[PDB]
Amino acid sequence: NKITPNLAEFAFSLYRQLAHQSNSTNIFFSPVSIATAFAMLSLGTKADTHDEILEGLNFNLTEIPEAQIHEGFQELLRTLNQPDSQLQLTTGNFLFLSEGLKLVDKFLEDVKKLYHSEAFTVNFGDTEEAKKQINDYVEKGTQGKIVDLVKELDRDTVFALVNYIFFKGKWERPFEVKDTEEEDFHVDQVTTVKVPMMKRLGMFNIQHCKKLSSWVLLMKYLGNATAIFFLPDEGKLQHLENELTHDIITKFLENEDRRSASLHLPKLSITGTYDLKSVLGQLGITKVFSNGADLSGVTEEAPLKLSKAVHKAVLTIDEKGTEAAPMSIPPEVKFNKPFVFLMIEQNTKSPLFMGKVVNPTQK
């Protein structure tokens, strides 16, 4: 591809932003899902409001232009939602604009054409009636999987953006279920939760990276995906999260050896809701949320500005995989403690998902 280099960093710089604010919760989101959502939204913005968004995603408009970025995002977004694509990954965008605006046509047009997104006008006057239409709009277009999302709306809201994404993959080489069994997972030096622990002795592209001071495991997905797990040495969690860099993962990936290992990957299902305004705000993206907001590409009547931007992602990890099938002690590698992981898109290498698991039970 050609944006992986930047989304990769966006992914990271986005991560150390949500992690900074609560090193006690699980963290899970799709860097691509979001960039896509703002790259999409950028379509209806102009001037600085516009350039500030694409830059905020680590793009340098003077060394590459939009009419190529949008090109790249769409090439990737296809890969995922594609036809044969049985990777089981759903994702979309909701756009709620205050009813009473002659919204430019072309916009809605492009939006629901390339960036898989739908627009719905609502009555922001009634703080509760909008809350209602929305929570319900979402619960309908989400197949009833996301309920009562928006807990509480604002008062002067006039534009709201909801971005979602569910994912549950099957591995190339699956785990027998008769083998998984409950085990201790040390979330803290004091707390300990019991959790189902999938286990399998196999040939892995696992290796103990000294630079990151942590075991790094690679697990291929059935499809155009790949998951990389990082198990950090005692108290090296913080370090790991600090020394991570695209150039490093990139190298790891390149290598092609493989050695015996006894894996203890935990069976888990986690999600993560986040309010982007604040975070992206820290990452440079402000105008679209401020007052000047140049959203002329969306409406030409009154002023307008993104008031709320929410992101919900859901992941499920299990033993599922392709239906099918005393001489050198292999290293035991048990993920029974906080660990960081990242999902890559096989073709483009872009960062599909990113997270930390601090408690397999927490929600």
Author numbering: 24 to 348, 357 to 394
Provide text from the study.
The plasma protein α1-antitrypsin is principally synthesised by hepatocytes and protects lung tissue from degradation by inhibiting neutrophil elastase. It is the archetypal member of the serpin (serine protease inhibitor) superfamily of proteins. In common with other inhibitory serpins, the native fold of α1-antitrypsin is metastable and this property is utilised in the characteristic serpin mechanism of action.
The structure of Gly117Phe α1-antitrypsin was solved to 3.2 Å resolution, allowing confident interpretation of the secondary structure of the protein. The asymmetric unit contained three molecules with minimal intermolecular contacts and in an arrangement not suggestive of biologically significant multimerisation. Electron density was not seen for residues 349–356 (copy A), 348–356 (copy B) and 348–358 (copy C) of the hypermobile reactive site loop. Before incorporation of the Phe mutation into the model or any restrained refinement had been performed, clear density was apparent at the mutation site, indicating that its side chain was oriented away from β-sheet A towards the F helix where significant changes were seen. In the refined structure, the F-helix is displaced downwards (towards the bottom of s3A) by half a turn relative to its position in the structure of native wild-type α1-antitrypsin (2.7–3.5 Å between equivalent Cα atoms). Conversely, repacking of helix F–β-sheet A interface residues, in particular Tyr160, is necessary to avoid steric clashes with the adjacent Phe117 side chain and sustain favourable hydrophobic interactions. In the refined structure of Gly117Phe α1-antitrypsin, Phe117 forms the centre of a cluster of aromatic side chains, interacting with Phe119, Phe143 and Tyr187 (all at distances of 3.5–5.5 Å). The side chain of Tyr160 is in a solvent-exposed position in this mutant in contrast to its buried position within the helix F–β-sheet A interface in wild-type α1-antitrypsin but remains well placed for aromatic interactions with two residues of this cluster, Phe119 and Phe143. The increased biochemical stability conferred by the Gly117Phe mutation on the native fold of α1-antitrypsin is therefore related to increased stabilisation of the F helix. However, stabilisation of the upper turns of the F helix and/or its downward displacement as seen in the structure of Gly117Phe α1-antitrypsin will reduce the propensity for its remodelling.
